[PDB]
Design a protein around this ligand. Structure first.
Ligand code: CUA
Ligand code: CUA
Ligand SMILES: [Ca+2]
Ligand SMILES: [Ca+2]
Ligand SMILES: [Cl-]
Ligand SMILES: [Cl-]
Ligand SMILES: [K+]
Ligand SMILES: [K+]
Lengths: 581, 581
């Protein structure tokens, strides 16, 4: 199988890599593992102006004031348990957000700060009949209200919440209060259930405290019941947020309609749905096991036809030290990372289930050593009923001597493994910055991208409406509008010339520059940088982009095109003249 | 030779790629072309906290207020015309800066904003006896003073300057006022001469004007002459800058001792010294030629022993449409990018010099098609007398369909070419983000890096000194100190625990957290993120890092370690308790 992609050949799959603590999404080609694009999300990108432009800051909202993020879990929207290539969603653990990327344009187009929570970590998407909800965990227990009067984690009103976000509007759909906490989450192949791991059933703040119980749990959600109750008006609201909040905690040993708690050892981490839709599989972490929940049995467990939530457990195979995550080949095998043993282990799921019933059968097929300390792993199409069993990527946290030395900070090592046959074979070591946690792969044919921008694109639609209010036709016009101490420059750009090559303002004026790139050849991107003003943005063919800054320095100040666009690139410049105060 | 670096195998060279309009520097392994590390410079990095930490912000100075940069030209310090592996230097065109990276820790340790200029573009280093100076072009003509009274470029006080920076102290050494402008720059193999291309001899602000003259020039600097005048005290100063300024403009047709202007067609761009030290080679851009300046004729030219400046031109090879840059195989051949024709042309310098004198000889050896529109190019060790003729990288601006489609914004195509034989061979297409402009290669054995930090390292020495005055021992102390509205938290860290796991403050307190990673195992980095406060940073083994923020929200606020560091990483957390105002 494959591995090398020569000059002029194309990769077979797209890979969407989390940027981890660096805050972007990275687009790679697979199997070459080459990075094709960076999509700024929670990071400020000097190149495109993400975090500086008026269009980006509108999307970010009030959260545009943060210069950091911490992303882990990239996921592609689904239709009937297959990728539809519409959206990618990702979490921000640092500043508690979820963002949506439009895959047609490879840009973040929506962002939300989840209300009344701390630390968005686990994230996954409804699969069936389609991604109606984005599911996301808030990891940390906090007081409600968090007003500084109570700090105790055991308080009646100290808890965390499971979050559902409407995938299309990117507005909150509902929140569910839970016992313990939340780590990772996955969804079924019907749309009725979702599940999450919990490592802090103790509601402790100290290490020993958090490891006290032999068992924490997987919490299972009946979204049907949730939706039913929201429809009926049977919910509370918290603070000034209008989001429906349901109580999924236990009361005096009795369940809520919304949740069931399945005991699982021990500070479990991964929560993974098998490609056949049979199981939620929780990785044991401190327990050298995985726990297999039979989704089949969940209706009976919510109907109470079951005397014990442990009865939904149909497998608990011992695999090795520190199991963290599980993926699938669609051939009946599961692949689990063993952080401590530094291996990926291949195991047979139906054999594991028979072994749980006492049968003497070896469900373990192979252990591949990886380099070093694997976290997540991802098999091609593993989140869909189309799991194709071809490629596997294991994402390891300590690269040691696997790459040239680069100082005290090392890359992560994302290792590509061919799983197409009977024996797993390590084929590529991929260094990556700032710790991608997870990644997702999609077939080439699953992603359709725009070659050039549409003038009606929603990404800059508000800017078009601003322009129309000034009587500006963006496709043709070069004009300076004055409004008190505001100056709005509108210009077309066509290599190698800006449409407005000079303009004069007064010291202290707030200047908005709006640029529409009217080159129609694909790939002729323009840039716009104002020297010594901290101003920088990209304008691609048929895009409009705007940026606003104060002209607080008198004199001549040059601006230039940053994207090499024409033989006369260097000469694509202009002059802002600032009259003394 | 080579090409594929399999798992467990190591690359043969380091590549340092400029990060372009993105602002960082990128470390690659060559020939695999995989990215090993990102080093933040002008960008704000969420992962390591560059632009957020006190250490980084002190390095940036007043410029820390900018979130962007635009870099082009990375260069490694030299001893005796060979790479010494001490420092890498890079420009910022956006906000007029030069940065120094220490190659032992792979971090930016110094930064300067060049005074009284706009837009630092061309940058190269002194070769012999070693890198005493960093040479840097200010591209854009401005008024002096630039106070808004005059905007005219033709004003006798409107000009740009050539800049020299002390490589060791990173303070300005001198500036030289020039006629016209400055684009790219190189230095000879003795320390006496430097050279730069000019495209705006016209002092124009528009395309018509900038393209008028059949010829602009290469300006040549007699650095010895300049240094003499600084030593003599024969210089002026501009504004509040104490930097010695020398006047290298012709007056009434008369030459200064500092400069000579050599007419060259037309808007020339590349300015490259051959690895045998014989020629300054200017790429003709709008002329389909390069111009070769014999460096051994330069003493005569400054001595007044030559009839006209054109007497130093010893070759003017006709290469093809849009020649931009030139590199060297150390075997007597040059390689030039042709932007319009979209090719790299291999040519013999000796034979081109003979053809200029009349001889009939085809100096052109081969033209290789590249994909597409090449900007810079770089052969292994080309900036040194050790040019080894193994690898060539051509960095093309338009990748078209050479990679999977990723929307309207395309990657650059940095193509790896085997030049070890007589025939150039394309072996690899490397996609890159944000337009690297140039790159530089060095042998594995030319770079030596730290495995772990030294506690005495100058990078965070000021923080250590500050901590002492507070009566703190960073190596052991886990402590909170208070003064009015300020709170200084000092802690050690060892996987999987912060040394301080809780602290309480009053709403509105300015909090500085200083963390010392006391692990001694390589690769065991920690992170520190305060949820919902825009606070993020890296602390590597034996590093101290600090960061400051306001506690402007009452309640409980979690902080956590972002760097996956242990099986118990998820549990490396702590609590900031903020009492209501
Ligand atoms: Cu427009 Cu370069
Ligand atoms: Cu310290 Cu993860
Ligand atoms: Ca626990
Ligand atoms: Ca000119
Ligand atoms: Cl998971
Ligand atoms: Cl050059
Ligand atoms: K790591
Ligand atoms: K490009």
């Amino acid at each position: 199988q494959k591995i090398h992609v020569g000059p002029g050949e194309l990769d077979d799959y797209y890979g969407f890599w989390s940027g981890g603590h660096q805050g972007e999404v990275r687009v790679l080609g697979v199997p070459s593992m080459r990075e094709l694009m960076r999509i700024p999300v929670f990071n400020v990108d000097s190149a495109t102006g993400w975090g500086l432009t008026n269009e980006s800051r509108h999307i970010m909202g009030d959260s545009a004031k943060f210069l950091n993020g911490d992303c882990h879990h990239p996921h592609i929207s689904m239709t009937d348990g297959k990728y539809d290539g519409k959206y990618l969603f990702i979490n921000d653990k640092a500043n508690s957000r979820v963002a949506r990327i439009r895959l047609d344009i490879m840009k973040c187009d929506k962002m939300i700060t989840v209300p009344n929570v701390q630390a968005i970590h686990g994230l996954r998407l409804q699969k069936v009949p389609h991604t109606k909800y984005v599911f996301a965990n808030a990891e940390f227990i906090i007081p409600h209200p968090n007003d500084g009067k109570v700090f105790d984690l055991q308080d009646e009103n100290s808890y965390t919440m499971y979050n559902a976000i409407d995938a299309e509007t990117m507005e909150m759909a509902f929140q569910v209060i839970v016992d313990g906490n939340l780590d990772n989450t996955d969804a079924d192949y019907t749309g009725r259930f979702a599940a999450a791991t919990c490592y802090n059933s103790e509601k402790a703040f100290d290490l020993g405290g958090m490891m006290r119980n032999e068992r924490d749990w997987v919490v299972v959600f009946d979204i049907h019941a949730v939706e039913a109750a929201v429809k009926a008006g049977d919910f509370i609201t918290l603070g000034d947020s209008k989001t429906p909040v349901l109580d999924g905690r236990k009361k005096d040993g009795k369940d809520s309609k919304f949740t069931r708690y399945v005991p699982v050892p021990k500070n479990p981490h991964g929560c993974n749905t098998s490609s056949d839709g049979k199981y939620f599989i929780a990785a044991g972490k401190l327990s050298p096991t995985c726990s297999m929940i039979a989704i089949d049995k969940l209706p009976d467990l919510f109907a109470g036809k079951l005397a014990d939530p442990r009865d939904v457990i149909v497998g608990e195979p011992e695999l090795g030290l520190g199991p963290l995550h599980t993926t699938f080949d669609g051939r009946g095998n599961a692949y689990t990372t063993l952080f401590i043993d530094s291996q990926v282990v291949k195991w047979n799921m139906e054999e594991a289930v028979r072994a749980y019933k006492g049968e003497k059968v070896n469900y373990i097929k192979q252990k591949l050593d990886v380099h070093y300390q694997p976290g997540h792993l991802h098999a091609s199409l593993c989140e869909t009923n189309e799991a194709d069993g071809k490629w596997l990527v294991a994402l390891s946290k300590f690269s040691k001597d696997r790459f040239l030395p680069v100082g005290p900070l090392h890359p992560e090592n994302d290792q590509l493994i061919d799983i197409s046959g009977d024996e797993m074979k390590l084929v590529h070591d991929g260094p990556t910055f700032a710790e991608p946690h997870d990644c997702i792969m999609a077939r080439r044919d699953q992603i359709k991208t725009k070659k050039i921008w549409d003038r009606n694109d929603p990404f800059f639609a508000p800017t078009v409406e601003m322009a129309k209010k000034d009587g500006i036709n963006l496709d043709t016009d070069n004009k300076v509008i004055r409004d008190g101490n505001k100056v709005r420059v509108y210009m077309t750009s066509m290599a190698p010339a800006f449409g407005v090559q000079e303009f004069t303002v007064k010291q202290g004026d707030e200047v908005t520059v709006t640029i529409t790139n009217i080159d129609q050849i694909e790939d002729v991107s323009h840039g716009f940088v104002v020297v010594n003003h901290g101003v920088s943005m990209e304008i691609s063919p048929q895009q409009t982009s705007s940026i606003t800054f104060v002209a607080d320095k008198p004199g001549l100040h040059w601006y230039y095109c940053s994207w090499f666009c024409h033989a006369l690139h260097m000469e694509m410049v202009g002059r802002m003249m600032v009259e003394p105060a």
